[PDB]
Amino acid sequence: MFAIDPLKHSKLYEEYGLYLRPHAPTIRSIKYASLIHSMLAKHAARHNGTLINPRMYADMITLGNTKVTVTDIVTYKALTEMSTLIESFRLPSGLALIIFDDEKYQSLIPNYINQLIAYTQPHIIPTWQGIADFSDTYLRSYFKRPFELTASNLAAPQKYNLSPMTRSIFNNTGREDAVIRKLYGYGEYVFIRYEGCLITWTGIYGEVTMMVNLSKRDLGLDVGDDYLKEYKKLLFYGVITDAIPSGISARSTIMKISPHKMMNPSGGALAVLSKFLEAVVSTNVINATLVVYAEKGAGKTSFLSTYAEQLSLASGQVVGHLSSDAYGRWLAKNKDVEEPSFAYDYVLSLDTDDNESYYEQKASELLISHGISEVAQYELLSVRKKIKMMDEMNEVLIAQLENADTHSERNFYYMVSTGKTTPRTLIVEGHFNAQDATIARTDTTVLLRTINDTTQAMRDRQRGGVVQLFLRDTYYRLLPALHTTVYPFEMLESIRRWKWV
Amino acid sequence: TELYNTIFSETRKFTRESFKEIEHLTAKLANDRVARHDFLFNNSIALISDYSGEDSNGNQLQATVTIPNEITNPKEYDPSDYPLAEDESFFKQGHKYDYLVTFRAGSLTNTYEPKTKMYKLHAALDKLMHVKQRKSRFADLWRELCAVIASLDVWYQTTNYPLRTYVKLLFHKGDEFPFYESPSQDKIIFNDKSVASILPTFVYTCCQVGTAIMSGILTHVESIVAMNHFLHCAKDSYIDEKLKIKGIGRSWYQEALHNVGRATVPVWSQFNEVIGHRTKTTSEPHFVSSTFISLRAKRAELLYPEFNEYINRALRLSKTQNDVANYYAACRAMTNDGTFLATLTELSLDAAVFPRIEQRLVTRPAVLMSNTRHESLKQKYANGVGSIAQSYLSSFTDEIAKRVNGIHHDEAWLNFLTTSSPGRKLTEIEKLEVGGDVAAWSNSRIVMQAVFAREYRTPERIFKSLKAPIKLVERQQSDRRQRAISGLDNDRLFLSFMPYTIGKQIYDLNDNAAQGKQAGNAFDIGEMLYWTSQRNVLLSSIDVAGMDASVTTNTKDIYNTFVLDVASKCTVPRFGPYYAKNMEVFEVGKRQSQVKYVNAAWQACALEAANSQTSTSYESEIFGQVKNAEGTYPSGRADTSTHHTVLLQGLVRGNELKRASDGKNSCLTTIKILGDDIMEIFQGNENDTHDHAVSNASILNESGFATTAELSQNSIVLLQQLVVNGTFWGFADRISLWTREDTKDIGRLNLAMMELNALIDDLLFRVRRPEGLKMLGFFCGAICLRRFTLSVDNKLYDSTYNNLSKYMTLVKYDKNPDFDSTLMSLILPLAWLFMPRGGEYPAYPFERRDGTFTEDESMFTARGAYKRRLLYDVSNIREMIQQNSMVLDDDLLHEYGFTGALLLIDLNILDLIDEVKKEDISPVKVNELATSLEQLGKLGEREKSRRAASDLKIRGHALSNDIVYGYGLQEKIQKSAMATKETTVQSKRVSSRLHEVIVAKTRDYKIPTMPADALHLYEFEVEDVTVDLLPHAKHTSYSNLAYNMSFGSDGWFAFALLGGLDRSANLLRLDVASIRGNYHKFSYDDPVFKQGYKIYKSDATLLNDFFVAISAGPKEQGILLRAFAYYSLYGNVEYHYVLSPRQLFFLSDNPVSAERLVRIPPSYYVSTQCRALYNIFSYLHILRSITSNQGKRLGMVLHPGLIAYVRG
């Protein structure tokens, strides 16, 4: 007995690569579980969507020992009906409730099954990269076990002991399904279809997996290509599934590409982003603002410019974008002027990468004052020696977050966010969580994770890599994951799912 | 009128004609608004300019009534006082005037087009000036001023006191009042537009200054100084100038107590006892005296120079500690207004809820075990204040993990689930789905969870909550700002419930906290009274400014690591929609992704920690929807105080362990924290104590908190209770008798008089003269709370008037065509104030038939059914014991009008009003909702209890609805539903049900007497033998331990007779509490006990059904069996007195302590419960009659009917 009924919702199990074996004890058991699902869905809808005695239902179904028989009747009429259903099965034991360990699966479990979970030992099937494993008891009994064809495994189905009623085929040959079908004789069989990719790279420390939400034809990459080739599709649609720091870099090549299931976006990410889009649409709100944090080197500006473009084209309004190093490049030029210009065009004209930041100057002087000038000198220090310097960098960060003077950071974002000619909706970036009291007043703030080893991406660039690595480490030391973690494909799916006009 | 030239003005006793005159004159001041204008303003009053008298100690002081020009002739409205931003999205960032500015009340016009930003701003300033200034607690604001003026007139017997001159100079504008408040429009209507704008609040200011004169705190010259200060503060902006010098004009007292330099103080024991008195220097150390220079400079350049001269006078002329206490209470009356401080929350938002970074930043801990979305599951600090806090908080996790495992969390969530307002409001789809009555009732939180109980186990409920914003809601509080606080919905409250459960269990494992330790009496101040009588002590009330706002996200992470350690050590499956499962995980060092077993509580804690959104979203009427910057503590959560308590005790005790590890001693003895209030007490030499105090303040600065070092040798502050050298210094101006926060202005009159009694009892051991406050409460209850208007049907109007007008007066109104029902008032006699279930106020000497007066009831007298004894006390019990009769003398009780008062009490209006609201709620929907709500935790118990209840119903009589355990959830939902509305024809049936009781009651009424009030009759005779004073009468004569505990006062002499309160000496506890009330917890007139006793006198085999239908434990079963056996055998007598613990703040609760004062003859002990009964008699008589207790030994005479009733 699964949580979601495979006879009604067969297409969802087809999405995982799990096909129904054609119509035996397992064949009786799946139909009995479907009748139990229909009976529970009937009994739930008579009392506010709830079940009247869920421990009794859970015992009668999962354990299969309790029999209720009338020989009040009103309070136990549903239980007598369920008892006369289960007694007519003559099963030796009870039907164990079966859940997958996926997030997309648990959001589609019905309410009555969720009420019965709290009085049941479920059979929780793990997932590797979203696909439930096929070497389980129930998924072998009720479903077709897959068979993978590779370049080496490729043969006629007569060579192995395959059959249409037991095995389904996973084409991993890199060839068209019609060519495999009418060239080798796989015509009677059935193919599981996946929509994404799974790419293994050659990392600095080992090998690195990556899951992409694009098809292998949409993603123009083959085995042996480059990381900087087709980088934008990977940044917009890719998620590395290893522990950070995963040593991915601009030199990593492809070891293997396989078709694989598309990732499903999270609940809280789409909830916070739809909260922001509700703030964008509604006329009740004068200023809408999104606060995005990322580590220094995640490539966050290049995606959020595309996000501002897609939001402008989908919403019909004008969407601005204040960069992460906007205040530093502002304050490097205006810390001496008593009455500076807070206008949006003047600020936006200073967010180019040729302008030097104030914090990078101060950190350059701080690294010079200890004698640190090369990246190899900074790597060769101890952790306590780094933290002793990062505390002085925090002493120079606190002087701009403490008060609200005419050059404070809170005054800067107040004057830019509340200007005459500034856009209505701003996408404002930040480095660390102490800027929450300083970046403009919101109710949506997220954290952006991309496929960039941010300690490797900052030692692979010029213009003072020591200062960039030092400021990355300081900002990491001031940034936990205490807001909602959001990936870029989730930020694009938030616009694609929100209905406009 | 001439109300200071009465018989009560010169005798203060209720004779036959003094009571008639004082009832005739106060009913004049309540009815018409013509006589109040004549009472407050008349040409017979001559104004005064210069004045001279004494201050609070006896020193001569001279002052002058000075009205500023800015109150008399206000300026026109300046629109630059409330600016905006450039985009007009909100008010300006650093805008100065945060409250209402003094301008001319007609100068605020609205010449803009509607639906314009400036139109919204001027409409909101209209809302501020006309609506947000009316705050009156009991009556209209011109009736609450006549009460104060009348009480001052009758106390001082004259009129030439300066507060009358302030009233006439500020409010005599024309031949009418300058303004009035209307309950029909719910706003103030200005009759003279040329008057000031802040001028309606000076009514409440004059009421508070008159209350302080009645207190004994201020004299008349000090009232001149106070009113000059409050009129100087309104010269630019009243509330802003009040808050700017709110602490400067108070904190001078440490310097005065230094310059005294010599004090003889009480000495308190370890066990809440006064054991000695000692003489010691009050000279502060060298590091305290260095702050005096800065405070002198700021005091010289900020304050009004007359009040600054008064502070320098107080520093210079004080000789003992009592002088410093008296001048400090007077400056408390001069700096605080006694009003609730309120404006538009769009103004005060940016100063009450906006997050701030004050000190150095807080870093993160190293993540050691991470989620697959890289959220944190386990984390540990490298170095900083996080390691310091965790070095103390990581030795309790292994015990809190055991304590959390034995808690059923769904039943804890149902018991935690309140009837308050949830965050989100149901939209039209769910309103179409459920019925209309459910949609009306769904403004509760428990009805809300009973509606959405179908998806309690669904995980997407949590993510659905992250789409809804957090609502902001206002508060009001005296002496402080507005404090915009948050209110969040069920699921955001549910995420913060498991860290609330985890952080609450720390309170049982140490003594750093203060949550479970309060009682309302001197046990609240046991630690402060003990640790100020010691020597070589350093006392410290460190002040963390803005605890809710200064906590960033990284400061919350210090609590998050503690919660995640406790959650990782425990084993809790099935918390909410979460369950224990093998969860894929990232670790440190492990390149790949591991798999570990993660329970439900640690999933809930990790998802709560890694999805944090604080920012409250207030929907304004000016700007639309206003949000806040992120990074405040959300402050409306379940763990909104346990967080602060755990974090502060972790920082302090970790500093203690860090100093012990660095080779330094720690001399910290106790800390007490309730969140935002630390109280540190050190002991040692000055170097050690100062070093440890500086280290504690610096380690609070390291965690990102702006502290204010308030440390000394002899004073200590915790939870607004000041203890200076074994002596309580109460804050009398914190209690506002005249202003009110919610401004419900309750339609109930017995409840209003109970509210007044509660405030007057709370003002008892912080006031200096309680007799004047008694008289103030009498005149406010006799002017403000007389008339009572209710709507009566047109067919019954003259019928009810003809039935009711026979004993007390009534007021009629117009007949109001084109409508059905018109309202009519219920003006009442003064004897309603003194009766049980009526007023229950301490009375005055009533003259008896024989000329001898009744005794003056003190402020310590009882309430409840004991107040029926005043009938027999004015009926001359002294004659009753020698005539052997129980004749109540109804003629004299009709001369004083007690019989109409008891008639109006016997009408029982409020119970009928509540029952006709109860007669509407449909039990089918309530049963359906609570049956849906029972399914979340602890199954089987409700059904077993209801099965036993139906069994006892079918083989017995019945059981009631609430008392059965299975119906308690239905009962709570049904009682939350009925508190919604009263708008309609329910008022017509109010008029109908109150019509049929007055037909039956007003045939003829005479006072019914029970046999049970034969024990109210008894008296006491004064012998010639002087009793011996308790030996702490000599220790507590120097430096009185409250403001009314002075040498010779009634509180001091009652404390010298009855002695202090004791927690160990419980001599008679079963009999006293049983004939007062409960056996153990269950009272005798409790429906549980009444239904159980009815089953008890029935067939006794039904008790097996009873204890299961109520679902009581075995110990509760034994308690109820012993209660039955004790109520049958000699539970026939009961006395039912009520004394509040705040009323006896230093005195004793136990009536045994009055046995040594009364000589009872031994031929009166004819039953086993005579001794405790007689001790109640003597205890209540000695507390009731302290004001004429010169110290002789008493002797109780009894009545033969009392003895026959005690026998049987």
Next chain:
RNA sequence: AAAAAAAAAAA
């Protein structure tokens, strides 16, 4: 018109 702690009364 939120959450915690202590206190007084009524159905």
Next chain:
RNA sequence: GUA
């Protein structure tokens, strides 16, 4: 001194 309403609706």
Next chain:
RNA sequence: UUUUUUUUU
């Protein structure tokens, strides 16, 4: 258990 009220965070 509810409702009202007070002190306090």
